[PDB]
Amino acid sequence: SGAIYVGNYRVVNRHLATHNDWANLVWEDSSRDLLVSSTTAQGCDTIARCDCQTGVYYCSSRRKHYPVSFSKPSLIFVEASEYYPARYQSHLMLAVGHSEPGDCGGILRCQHGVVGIVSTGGNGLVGFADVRDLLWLD
Ligand SMILES: COc1ccccc1[C@@H](NC(C)=O)C(=O)N1CCC[C@H](C(N)=O)C1
Numbered sequence: 418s419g420a421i422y423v424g425n426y427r428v429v430n431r432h433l434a435t436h437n438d439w440a441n442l443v444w445e446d447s448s449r450d451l452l453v454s455s456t457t458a459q460g461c462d463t464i465a466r467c468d469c470q471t472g473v474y475y476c477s478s479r480r481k482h483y484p485v486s487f488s489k490p491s492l493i494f495v496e497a498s499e500y501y502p503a504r505y506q507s508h509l510m511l512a513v514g515h516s517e518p519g520d521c522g523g524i525l526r527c528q529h530g531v532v533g534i535v536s537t538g539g540n541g542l543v544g545f546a547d548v549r550d551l552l553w554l555d
């Protein structure tokens with residue numbers, strides 16, 4: 418689990434969005450595994466606007482932060498799960514690092530701010546849903 422809180426927006430993995438997120442829906446994209454909802458209180462986070470390919474992410478299954486080298490946002494095949502059919506997920510960045518299904522929502526950050534959140538993984542890989550292109554979050 419995990420969310421980004423920026424301005425009057427809450428960014429979460431679409432497959433983990435609550436009844437409340439859907440009732441205050443601003444934008445969602447099944448192909449990116451992202452959902453944005455509106456909030457009344459002002460958020461604590463700031464978004465990176467950069468081309469960084471190194472950063473640090475929080476891994477809840479280890480209660481630890483790990484440094485990562487990650488690929489540019491791209492279209493990657495993701496096997497069927499209990500939440501989605503087999504499909505291509507867009508705006509996804511892969512990296513070598515530990516992740517388990519419940520790690521989704523962990524924030525990836527560079528020196529410029531929030532880059533994205535954990536969305537995929539398996540076998541020593543961790544994938545992050547990019548949010549740096551969503552300029553309207555600011
Ligand atoms: C953090 O994700 C994982 C970690 C370890 C193992 C497996 C995973 C993920 N499976 C894959 C095929 O990437 C996973 O559990 N997902 C279920 C929820 C939706 C996710 C998505 N489609 O973006 C996929």
Ligand SMILES: [Zn+2]
Nearest residue numbers: 467469527529
């Ligand atoms: Zn950066």
